[model samples]
Target chain A: SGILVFDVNETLLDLTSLSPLFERVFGDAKVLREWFPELILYSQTLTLTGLYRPFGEIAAAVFEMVAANHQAKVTPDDIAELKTRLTSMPAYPDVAPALTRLQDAGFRLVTLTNSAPSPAPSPLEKAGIASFFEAHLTVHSSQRFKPHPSVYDSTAETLGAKPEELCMIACHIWDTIGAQARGWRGGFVARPHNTPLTLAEVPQPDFIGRDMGELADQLIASLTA
Target chain B: SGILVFDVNETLLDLTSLSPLFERVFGDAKVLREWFPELILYSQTLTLTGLYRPFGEIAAAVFEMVAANHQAKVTPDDIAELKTRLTSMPAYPDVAPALTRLQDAGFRLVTLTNSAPSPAPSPLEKAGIASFFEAHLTVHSSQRFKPHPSVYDSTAETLGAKPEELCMIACHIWDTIGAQARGWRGGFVARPHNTPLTLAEVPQPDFIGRDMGELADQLIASLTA
Candidate 1:
């Protein structure tokens, strides 16, 4: 009944699977948590300042910065492993079933991620759920990251849809906050590391759940109601 | 003589002095580090989405979020102490000497901060350096935070100066990156917890130093030369 735009990385893919790589390199499993937000922070930094770098490059740069913070040395091999692991993460067990449920409930599923598109099979394809999505959209075309008004506006334009006809489903409050600011609805999947901003100054999500399965249930009930 | 815009918080005032509060409330001194970046991240999230809140409120909400994460109980006394400590932070040891050097070098000093204006004496005033600045600007006026082009653009407009005549002096790479993108020069003071994002994709600062003292030495020579 509506266009549901998903956020891929931590929303669908289990980035916790990549924790071993950070542990091997940084000797701390928690470094992955630190790396993820820094990655998002600098992506917003680059976009706000009229700079554009593919998310993959931004990810590597952030990893290097985190390494610098800890006085740790990162080798080229470590970089390669990061790239391989990042693009090869499996979908969380709840993801595929929830996508099927949402699709069955008559919602058109698409992905809008900061992750740059690859020539190879995408992480979604690798995780065995590419067919569930009608299309995969990346911010690369806009040369800006999410939470920027332009990114959400351009996505709506490309989809031939009105802002009110679109809904963003993601684990990040910022993603939904930006989408909602542009008149689109937002469904937040509050994963372990993600939570709602909740202050009156920010737009609260229309739907929030502890996981994608729970989120899908709520979205289906509300949208189909 | 050029207009130099300085950033508050860790750039001029030493925030490490507030660590004892975090240590008392959360039982971990490092929670302060986590709180600061999260504060900036959510503030940008709000700004990018066309939402506005005073920085002090954002700081408190972020403290609540961090406390929730650790399941720490924060009393009203804790928040009161935070407000006091945040406004009463001492200037870094090098700040006064550096400000004196730059002022004597014929620069017009201004402050462009995310911190909201209060009727009370500002943190800078409390830190004994308010007299150095010709003006104090806050994102509250624009209703948008730093790294948004409007902030730097409007700041220059207020000064009746061209972008080329303005320079942003900040400890945060994101601040300088935004200023540089808008054609203003940037001097980055690499505080212990802050560093330059040296990747080619981001704009590098015009001057870099380990502290304000060294940064002043560079800015005075370069701007004078």
Candidate 2:
């Protein structure tokens, strides 16, 4: 069986848990919705130029920028608070069971994320779901971010799966589409804030589930079939 | 004299003029600030994938995306109205005099914008500064977006200057840095909202000006030198 690759961020972690803090820090409730996307775009801008910084470093810089734009005075403590809150997040309730179900169904599991290696592992470890994954793939390892074909190719090569043989599980459309672009199958977990973009010609994920558990069920049925 | 190239959006046009429109339409005061950077990032993502659409279309797409995320219902009429405001924004007060002063200084002037050729000229035309530019170039025409090296290189070639002899004048650090990377000396107009990113190694823009007037003063002095 081909390996199943999972994306870490919102796919497994519930970022909305940070919203209460975001409202107080950013001076508005939905500001996290704004900050999250801007943070992603700024990171990609770095990668587009062949530069790689730890995602946290970029997030801190962007946090200052966004904070200023909103006319909010964010203290250094707020940045540190955001980090501590983000790193300590527990996996979504559906996450561990889904991982267990997939592995028990004879599938190999891994994580490929844009996060740097050091911080990337800690979230899974802190969530106590570290054993669910066999290998962790960090974009930092290759110095190329996700959605770039090279990163996907390198992952496939190292994992010993043909691009078509592997399936990617992610809540973000860009990540899923990136996997699809490289001819890998994709399972889209429909997190509330993660909507599929109608931009153009991006391949639809092969499976769409309302949550990790639902996605795992669909994937397991297909593998068994 | 070296050929001078201008960047259109926020560099020439004062996008904040639409802040009133954005505040009511987006139901937030800072969303126009949010949308501008989001729009740039979305445009680059399109260019990164080797696809190009007019900046306006991408703007519309991102506008809807941002609107939905913020739980706002942006009617199609709202989208059209937003475009009207965006297109009709007047140039910064410093723009026309700067254009005329630079032209009178005997420097050949042109514009290189990320917009398609069709809507590109209207902004300069609307700003009443169209006559000062000898020609207009667009990423739409070249099918290459800024910071890609090729767009900057190709524009310099068309202007009959070695990259060193061409200078890009803009408020965006990314555009200025793109020009710099191609051996073009860069004149960066430092907009208060557009911060220079220190996330990694980006080429420092050759000239930094507080506003378009200051940038023009520096540019004219160079020509007169």
Candidate 3:
């Protein structure tokens, strides 16, 4: 009855392949662990400024800076190789089946990501889940990144749905909070080992489940109700 | 014989003027404590990407994102006013006299800062000590920011000094280690209550002094020797 939105990267796609590459290049497997949060922070900054810069460009910049700071020698070809690897990263084992199930249910499925549009297709295609998605949208299209209300609003409008009718499901609490703030019903799919919410500030999410299948069931029930 | 360089912002400029405004907007004087590190991280990212965006644009973007994250209601005028206050921030009490002494000693003086060129002029002019330096270089010009060798190299090349002959003076241990790795002499000025170089991997600075005056004395002694 309504659109089901998925967050790319860690939400459904597994980036653990980059850990060895990152440790080899930067001497720390945790380099991207540090880089990803800052990447999200800068992506949001670009959105707030009403400026547009591709997420890949920002990612490359951050990676190069980290390499330089650590005195790690990452060549041009190495950068190109890393980009290729990143784009071709496989989705988690559950992603394709879950997407198939959702699409078979006659739900409009879409992706909202902070990454560039060019590289986004590779992962979905690699995972065999590209066929299920109606559209793969990135922050670049709206010139605003995620956790910004504008990003959520623009995505819903593009998908021909009102915010209240859209269901946002992500593994990130911040993104869930953002969607909830804008009147969308949000579900938190707790990725294994993901940090749990502190519960000190805001109320818990409307629906919390261990995986996308469980989240899908909850969404179906809510829609039927 | 050698060029002496200093960092701006918190190192030499008193940002206390923004405390009242930030407290009003963010409900805390320590709002900057949360945003400043992210600002530096993105500034470096902009350089590494071979992108040229004004530092003010980046700063305002980060400020807005921080405010938005906290759900603080801030207007465009409030951001503009904060920018204005930032540009007029005076130099720390010790900065002018220390630079004056270094200039008097006939050493080439320069500032290699992360601040953008256009908006930074006002603060330098406001401080009334702009003439003491032979150059005021911004990271934008090099397309490489601090903690990167390109930034240090550009500053050294601009001053016509070899890396070994140029000395970087700062309140930040990270900057000191970054400069030292590139063969530039580093002096850590113990300003306020900033953290010391506790990272085991980083090399210790060549000299540590309580203030710029003490640093100037060490530089003078080294040259005389």
CAPRI class assigned to model 2: acceptable
By DockQ, the better pick of 1 and 2 is: 1
How good is model 2 by TM-score?
0.88
Per-model chain B TM-scores are: 0.97, 0.92, 0.90
lDDT of 1: 0.87
Clashes of each: 0, 0, 0
Off by over 4 Å in 1: B223-225
**lDDT (Cα, 0-100) at A119 in candidate 2:** 44
In the range A40-146, model 1's lDDT, one tens digit per residue, is 88888888778899888888888887787777899999888899998998988898899999998999999998988887688999999899999899998999999
Off by over 4 Å in 2: A17-25, A68-79, A119-121, A221-225, B17-21, B119-121, B221-225
Give lDDT: candidate 2, residue B182.
70
- Considering only chain B, report the TM-score of model 2: 0.92
Q: Rate the local accuracy (lDDT) of all candidates.
A: 0.87, 0.78, 0.70
List model 2 lDDT by residue over A47-139, tens digit each: 666667788887777777667655688797998988887676778999999999898898999999887876444888988888888998878
Full candidate order by lDDT, most accurate first: 1, 2, 3
Q: Output the number of the lDDT-best candidate.
A: 1
- Candidate 2 per-residue lDDT over residues B1-225, each given as its tens digit: 778898888888887877886788766767776677667776766656556667778788778866765667889788898778777778778888877877787878899988776644487797788888898888776665776777887787777789877988887777876777677888888776765655556676777778877877888776656
Superposed on the true chain A, the predicted chain A of model 1 yields a TM-score of: 0.97
Residue B79 C-alpha lDDT in model 3: 81
